[PDB]
Structures are given as C-alpha cells and as structure tokens.
Design a protein around this ligand. Sequence first.
Ligand SMILES: O[C@@H]1[C@@H](O)[C@H](O[C@@H]2CO[C@@H](O[C@@H]3CO[C@@H](O[C@@H]4CO[C@@H](O[C@@H]5CO[C@@H](O)[C@H](O)[C@H]5O)[C@H](O)[C@H]4O)[C@H](O)[C@H]3O)[C@H](O)[C@H]2O)OC[C@H]1O
Ligand SMILES: O[C@@H]1[C@@H](O)[C@H](O[C@@H]2CO[C@@H](O[C@@H]3CO[C@@H](O[C@@H]4CO[C@@H](O)[C@H](O)[C@H]4O)[C@H](O)[C@H]3O)[C@H](O)[C@H]2O)OC[C@H]1O
Ligand SMILES: O[C@@H]1[C@@H](O)[C@H](O[C@@H]2CO[C@@H](O)[C@H](O)[C@H]2O)OC[C@H]1O
Length: 427
Amino acid sequence: AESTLGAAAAQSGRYFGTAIASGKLGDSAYTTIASREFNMVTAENEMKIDATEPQRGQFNFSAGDRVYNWAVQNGKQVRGHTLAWHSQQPGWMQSLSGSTLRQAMIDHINGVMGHYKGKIAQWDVVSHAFSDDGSGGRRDSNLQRTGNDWIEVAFRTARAADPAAKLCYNDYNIENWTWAKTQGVYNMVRDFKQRGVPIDCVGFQSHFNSGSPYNSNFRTTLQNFAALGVDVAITELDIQGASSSTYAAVTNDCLAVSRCLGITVWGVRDTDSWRSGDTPLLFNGDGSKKAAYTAVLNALNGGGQIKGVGSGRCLDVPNASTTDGTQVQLYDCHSATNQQWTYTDAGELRVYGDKCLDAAGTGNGTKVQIYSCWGGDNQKWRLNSDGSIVGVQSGLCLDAVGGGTANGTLIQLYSCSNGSNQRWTRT
Ligand SMILES: O[C@@H]1[C@@H](O)[C@H](O[C@@H]2CO[C@@H](O[C@@H]3CO[C@@H](O[C@@H]4CO[C@@H](O[C@@H]5CO[C@@H](O)[C@H](O)[C@H]5O)[C@H](O)[C@H]4O)[C@H](O)[C@H]3O)[C@H](O)[C@H]2O)OC[C@H]1O
Ligand SMILES: O[C@@H]1[C@@H](O)[C@H](O[C@@H]2CO[C@@H](O[C@@H]3CO[C@@H](O[C@@H]4CO[C@@H](O)[C@H](O)[C@H]4O)[C@H](O)[C@H]3O)[C@H](O)[C@H]2O)OC[C@H]1O
Ligand SMILES: O[C@@H]1[C@@H](O)[C@H](O[C@@H]2CO[C@@H](O)[C@H](O)[C@H]2O)OC[C@H]1O
C-alpha cells in the first residue's frame, strides 16, 4: 500500500511511527489518525521511570499496558521509552546516589523489561547521557556519578532481561556530525561494539529547530553509526515550522541508509505536540494533513510553470494582475511572471514573490485566486505524486471548471477525482 505513512514505509521494510499519549486514546479524531497512519508506537510518557515505578519496588504498568495493547491491537510494534536516564525520575530515585542508585537502576530495568519481555521491538535503554556544553562528554547526573560505566551496565542488564529486544542508546542534538556531542556518542558506541557491549541501535531524536537545525550531514552521521554495525532510528522527529523540504530530507536520509529501521515523529497533531508553538508535526489541529505530510508520503513512495495535463495549458494570473481576489485561469504557456509559481517549504504556491494561490472557502466551486501571503491553511497546498494539488484546509483539489481546456477556463476547488482537469505537471 502507499496511501498512509506506515504502509508507504513498509514498502522498503521500514516503519513510520508516532508518540501516543494515553490521555488522548479516548479522542476519536486523534485515534482515527493514529491508527490509520502509523505502524510503530512509542508511549510519550507512560513507560518512563516515574510512570512505571512510582515507589522503589512498586511497579505500575496500567497506563503503559493501555498504550501497548492499543498499539498491537491496531497493527503497530512498540518502542520502549525509556529505562535509564536523568529526567522524569520519581522523587525516590532523584535522591539516590552511588551503589544504591546503581542497584535501583538495574532493578528498574529488570522489572520493566521483564513485564514486557518479548513484546518490545526496540528499547531506549539509556537516554540523554551526553552534555550540551560542547565538550562531548557525559552530562552530570546522579546516574553518571555512580560511575562512568553506568551506561555499559544498563545495556548488559537489558540484554539479559530481554534478549529479543533491540537495545538502543537515545539522545538529541546528535544529528549534526560536526557537533562534539555527536562525536562523543559515536566514540562510546564504537567502544561498545569493539568490547562486545550489547548495543543494537542508536536513536536520533531529531528535534530540529533554528536553535539546532537539520543539516544534510545527518545522513553522514547515520551512515557512520551504521558502519559500526548498529541499526539506527529516527525516534522523536519534529521540525519547527514543519518545512516540507526538511521533512522529506529527513525521510530520505533514513531511506538512504539500509540500517535505518524507521522514523517516528513525536506526536500526531500539532495541538498534541510538547511544542505546539512550533507547529512541528504532520497534521493540523483540525486533523488535516499538512504540506509536509504529502512530502513525507511521496518520499516514502519513491519520490516554474504548472501545466494542466488535460488542457496542456498553464496556471495563469489574468493579465498579470497583482490585485487580491483575482481568480486564476488556464492559459497558453509562455515565459511570463504571471505563470511562474514557487512552491515553498510552508506549502504555498507563490507568484510575483509575495502573492499566494488562495482558496476563498472550503467547498466545491470555491474560487481559487491570489491574495497576499500570510500563512493561512487556505493558502497551503499538498503536491501529490499523482499530479493532483490538494488544498490543506479544504482537502479539495485544484480543478479546471467544467473540465474546460480553453484559455480563460477558471480554477476552483473540487472533490478530487483523478480527472485530467485535476492533474498538473511542474515545468
Ligand atoms: O509530554 C512530554 C513529552 O513529550 C516529553 O518528551 C521528551 C521530549 O524529547 C526529549 O526531551 C527533550 C529533547 O530536546 C531538548 O531540547 C533541546 C535542547 O538543546 C537545544 O539546542 C541548543 C541550542 O543552543 C546551543 O547552544 C546548545 O548547545 C543546543 O543544545 C535544542 O534546540 C532543543 O530541542 C529538551 O530539553 C528535552 O526535554 C525526550 O526524549 C522525550 O521523552 O517529556 C516531557 C513530557 O511532559
Ligand atoms: O473520487 C471520486 C470523485 O471524483 C467522484 O465525483 C467526481 C467529482 O468531480 C466531477 O467532475 C467535476 C464536476 O464539476 C465541475 O465543476 C463545475 C462545473 O459547472 C460549474 O457550474 C460549477 O460551478 C463547477 O463547480 C468540475 O470541473 C469537474 O471536475 C466528476 O464528474 C465526479 O465523478 O465521486 C466519487 C469519488 O470516489
Ligand atoms: O484579455 C484578457 C486576457 O489577456 C487575460 O489573459 C491573458 C492573455 O494573455 C496572456 O499572455 C496572459 O498571460 C494572460 O493572463 O485573461 C482575461 C482577459 O480579459
């Protein structure tokens, strides 16, 4: 299949997952999208230390099992997140140190992995162990103070607890190869593989924003780790602004690495995001697919003027007008600014530089025109591989009225039909 992210990824033996929040599983809109699009699930918080072991020796898997069962019942594998790390520790663990903390760490791993033995595809055994100070060294935490060998111990413990689970080291800001942090993790994993430490994968959270931007060398990082003999996975992907090109780029990086198991985005809709203000996911709050969604889908499926297939004519702004409200038409193709459209990372189709293909409504027959660019979803479009152009807000296709092919045929929104008057080719 190839109409959903999970199915499209499966074509190359990969998966496309999301982070599921137990509190949202009772949401029809949420579950409809989640069950349909993803085939891998990570509990957003339900399998962390404080959630699974509120009291030392007292385990609670109610919430974790709810997400797990929903995942398997709906055809998704599960990534366990996370067994040992400095964040979100229950109060009792936060105050522990030395040998007692080391024992608690081990006990926690055995308890949680034991409960889910043989049912977890990947476990983020250790997370966030390195610092952001630029030294490339370990971050100072109670776990690190128990001995630099805590990570190695965590992994050896995990292997014995559940030999069937792939064991991953997970962290953020380790995507750009030139960063010290990235190098620190690389050296650690290289050391582990050389000494036989049981580690099967490295998880790259991939939280990209202007503070820690995506860089094409992320592919190099993935390939360098893959060369060590470990699988790699994009575990908590979200991109500030949800740039279509960046989302497609990350997707293609995984597809370019045979050892990249799959990609998980950190959430379903922008409104479900831990950083909703960065509108970093693939679905809008109203549940509509964003421009980035189609960019990712096209990439998973194999991956100027806009000319209509059925008419052989180009999307044209009448008399090269720059007046807001001017409805677009079909017209003989020629070199003119009123026929030069630029698709942006935000999903707009710009003309004249600051004018945007705009839909003045959401129903059939809605006039497609130009209007000042401002970022509305009625100015954002999805470029399908089949040649159709779908409005984000409306979910409707650009359509040449009445199947018209002559000069002057107007453009409207209309239920997608795969008709030639709804298919376009970029020149
Ligand atoms: O419901 C919530 C859960 O969703 C949430 O999940 C955790 C989210 O992801 C992981 O934790 C976060 C990872 O990203 C960190 O922020 C980085 C910090 O560094 C920034 O870049 C810096 C820019 O300036 C430079 O000088 C510096 O060197 C750079 O590091 C980067 O842009 C940010 O994205 C967050 O602090 C982490 O919390 C974790 O795996 C998930 O479990 O957990 C909370 C829950 O409520
Ligand atoms: O995917 C399937 C759908 O395609 C199918 O319904 C199709 C919907 O599009 C139909 O063609 C439309 C008909 O309307 C034309 O525009 C109107 C022309 O007259 C004007 O007065 C009016 O204002 C315009 O809106 C549009 O250009 C043309 O593409 C097609 O015939 C239907 O079959 O339904 C089943 C779906 O699975
Ligand atoms: O007379 C006007 C037409 O000129 C206009 O369409 C233009 C035709 O010439 C082409 O070179 C232009 O690109 C195209 O916009 O449509 C409206 C009509 O009244």
